[PDB]
Structure 1
Amino acid sequence: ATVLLEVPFSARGDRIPDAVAELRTREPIRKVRTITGAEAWLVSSYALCTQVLEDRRFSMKETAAAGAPRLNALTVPPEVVNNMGNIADAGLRKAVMKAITPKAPGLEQFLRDTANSLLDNLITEGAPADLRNDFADPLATALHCKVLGIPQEDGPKLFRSLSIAFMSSADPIPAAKINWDRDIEYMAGILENPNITTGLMGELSRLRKDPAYSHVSDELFATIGVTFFGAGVISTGSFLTTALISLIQRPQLRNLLHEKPELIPAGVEELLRINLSFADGLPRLATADIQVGDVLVRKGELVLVLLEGANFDPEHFPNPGSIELDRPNPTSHLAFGRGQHFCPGSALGRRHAQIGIEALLKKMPGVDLAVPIDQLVWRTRFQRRIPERLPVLW
């Protein structure tokens, strides 16, 4: 007697389990048990993953409903699962999205300067260097402070909420609320701080005092800052970290991008496609009975969209495990999701990784792992897959 297949399959972010391809082939929508004990449908083909993500009847909002089958425990207030809907309802979606593009004057230079400064410090200190804790995450953190308009020196404290905020836990996490409430208070103070005039929080601080937004809650303004800082920092830091691994493990690609940095955008797009940073399928709750492949998903059931199921689907990306800079459909992966909840920070996330990689390859053209790959320690029960340290030499 066997138990129902458990998700997630593996917290390792350096390789996809052979099991995913067998699952996709045999049962692209399959029942699984999540860490809470709930049952769910795990969708692992490109076609079915896009179907689910493009059908809003598979609702993100409704995953927060009391009594729903859960992937993991909420680490935010339930109304925050509807964060982008709340932002849209408040009339803030266009301004938010405009503030988080990589387009602001000087932002890319700041990113480059920050990356180069981080790297110089690593070079000064001498190998081995930890490229997660001492490069990718600080770069993500610095970027998001700059984007939000908040002091760089406030970044580390906000950052250290994230090892708990993005836990994938069977049970509510006491520290998540402590940190959430504290971080909200911080962002509320930011909105009241007259020195904060730039970035997302500077713009929100002005809109908050504009009569066209006088009935938007202060809670939502503060929430936008906390949520965009955290989702952005965890996602860019984790993605860049695991992209660096994939790059370091491909010396020929490393050398090609070092030699021809104009291919870095195509290389990052493939690193996005093969990225295993999201540790769990994206969750959605059926609000109707909906046919997905051979399964009639019933109203109230949980569906988990396995990004790497889609992104390594050979029917969509031939030779899926190979980084190919000349694919005909290069941005068609689901690394940034798809549909209603497509990542609003996609461009910023691309540029963060492009600039970080560009700077790394210039400063450390010899970069290599300083430990055997198997020695990386993969964070467990977390919504991202990340090695706790990424020791390199160069």
Structure 2
Amino acid sequence: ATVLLEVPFSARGDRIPDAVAELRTREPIRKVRTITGAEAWLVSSYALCTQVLEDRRFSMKETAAAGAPRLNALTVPPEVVNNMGNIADAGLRKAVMKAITPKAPGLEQFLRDTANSLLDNLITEGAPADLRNDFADPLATALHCKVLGIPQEDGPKLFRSLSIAFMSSADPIPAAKINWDRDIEYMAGILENPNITTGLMGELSRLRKDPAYSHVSDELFATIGVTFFGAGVISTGSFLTTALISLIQRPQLRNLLHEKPELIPAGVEELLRINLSFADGLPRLATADIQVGDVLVRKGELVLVLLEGANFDPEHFPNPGSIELDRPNPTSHLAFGRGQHFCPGSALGRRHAQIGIEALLKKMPGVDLAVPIDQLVWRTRFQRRIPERLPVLW
């Protein structure tokens, strides 16, 4: 006898497990058991992942209901799972989206100057360098302090919450409450701080005192600061780190992009497509009985949308393991999700990776791993796949 197939399959972010293609071909929706012991439907083809993500009867908000089958334990309060819905209901969606575009005057030059400073510091210190802790994550943190309008020197303490806040745990995490309550108190103080006049928190601070938003709660304003910092920093730092592995493992492409930097946006879109940064399928709870493939999903059941299942599906992306800069469908991957919950930071996340890669390739054209690839240590039981250190030489 064996037990039901367990997810996730592997915390490694540098290779896709052969099980994914076997599932996708033979059983593109099939039952699995999550780390909590709950059963779920794992969906692994492009067609069925898109069907679930575009049908709001597969609800994100409902995953937080008491008694639901769970992928993992909540690390935020249950109403915060509906964060974008609460931002939309408060009349703040357009304002939030406007503040986190990468097109803000000076923002790109700030990102390039920051990237070049971090790189020069590594060059001065000498190889080996850790491109996660001393490049990708400080670049993500500096970017998000600038986009929020908060002091750069407050970035490192806010960042140190994230190794707990983005855990994928079977059980509630006492330190995630301690750090969440402290980080909310910090954002509530930012909203009362007259020095904060720029970025997303300077905008929220003004709208909080405008009569049209006098009944939006202070808790929501503070929650937008904590969630957009945390989601943006973990997501951009982790994507850029694993994209740098994928580039270092393709010297032919590295060299192409160094020679023709105008191809960096196409290269980043393929690095998004092949990225294994999300450690778990995206969860949704069915609110109706819905046919998906050969399965009738029942109301109340959990569905998990496996992004690499869609993004490596050869029916959509032929030769899916290869980075090809001339595909006819290059932005149709699911790396930012799809539908109602498509990532609101997508443009910012693209620009952070394009600028970090352009800066790295000009400063360290010979960048290579300084350890054999199997020696990277992959974080476990986390919502992202990331190596704990990324040692390189150049």
Give me the TM-score of the superposition, normalised by structure 1: 1.00
User: Aligned residue for 1:325?
Assistant: 325
Deviation (angstroms), 1:251: 0.2
Counterparts of 1:283 and 1:139, CA distance in 2: 29
The whole-number CA distance in structure 2 between the counterparts of 1:175 and 1:231 is 18
Who is 2:70 aligned against? Answer: 70
Give the 3-state SS of the residue equivalent to 1:265 in structure 2. helix
Q: CA deviation at 1:200?
A: 0.2
Deviation at 1:269, TM superposition (A): 0.1
C-alpha separation between the residues in 1 aligned to 2:233 and 2:50? 26
Question: C-alpha displacement at 1:286, in angstroms?
Answer: 0.2
- Measured in 1, the distance between the counterparts of 2:179 and 2:51 equals 36
In 2, the alpha carbon distance for the partners of 1:240 and 1:347 equals 14
Percent identity reads: 100
Once the two structures are TM-superposed, the CA of residue 231 in structure 1 deviates from its matched residue by: 0.2
Q: What do residues 220-271 of structure 1 show as CA deviations (whole Å, max 9, x unaligned)?
A: 0000000000000000000000000000000000000000000000000000
Q: Once the 2 structures are TM-superposed, how far is the Cα of residue 388 of structure 1 from its aligned partner?
A: 0.2
SS in 2 for 1:201: helix
Q: CA separation in 1, counterparts of 2:45 and 2:222?
A: 37
Task: Give distance in 2, aligned partners of 1:257 and 1:225.
Answer: 35
Determine the C-alpha separation between the residues in 2 that align with 1:18 and 1:162: 30
Instruction: Give SS of 1:32's match.
Output: strand
Q: Deviations over 1:195-235 (max 9, x none)?
A: 00000000000000000000000000000000000000000
1: distance between equivalents of 2:124 and 2:300?
Answer: 56
Measure, in 1, the Cα distance between the counterparts of 2:80 and 2:238: 22
> What SS is found at the alignment partner of 2:227?
helix
Q: CA deviation at 1:34?
A: 0.2
- Secondary structure at the aligned position of 2:164 is classed as helix
Secondary structure in 2 matching 1:55: coil
- Distance in 1 between the 2:90 and 2:113 partners? 35
> Cα distance, 1:293 vs. partner?
0.3
Deviation at 1:180, TM superposition (A): 0.2
> Offset at 1:142?
0.3
- Give the deviation of 1:288 after TM superposition: 0.3
* CA apart distance, 1:279: 0.1
| CA deviation map 1:131-181 (0-9, x unaligned) | 000000000000000000000000000000000000000000000000000
Deviations 1:57-115 (A, max 9, x none): 00000000000000000000000000000000000000000000101000000000000
The aligned length equals: 394
Q: TM-score, normalised by structure 2?
A: 1.00
Shift of residue 28, structure 1, vs aligned partner: 0.3
* Partner deviation per Cα, 1:325-374 (whole Å, 9 max, x = no partner): 00000000000000000000000000000000000000000000000000
| CA distance, structure 2, for counterparts of residue 123 and residue 166 of structure 1 | 31
Match of 1:110, SS state, is: helix
Task: Give 3-state SS (helix, strand or coil) of 1:136's partner.
Answer: helix
Question: Aligned with 2:41: secondary structure?
Answer: strand
Structure 1 segments unaligned to the other structure (5+ residues): none
Q: State the Cα distance separating 1:184 from its structure 2 match.
A: 0.3
Between the aligned partners of 2:15 and 2:272, the Cα distance in structure 1 is 14
* Structure 1 consecutive aligned stretches of length 4 or more whose deviation exceeds 3 Å: none
C-alpha displacement of 1:303: 0.2
Q: Distance in 1 between matches of 2:23 and 2:364?
A: 39
Instruction: Trace 1:74-153 onto structure 2 (pairs within 5 A).
Output: 74-153=74-153
Residue of structure 2 in register with 1:174 after alignment: 174
Structure-2 separation of matches of 1:323 and 1:240: 16
Structure 1 distance, partners of 2:392, 2:180, is: 33
Structure 2 unaligned residues grouped into runs of 5+: none
* Post-superposition CA distance 1:8-53 (Å, at most 9, x none): 0000000100110011001000100000000000000000000000
Aligned pair 1:335/2:335, yes or no? yes
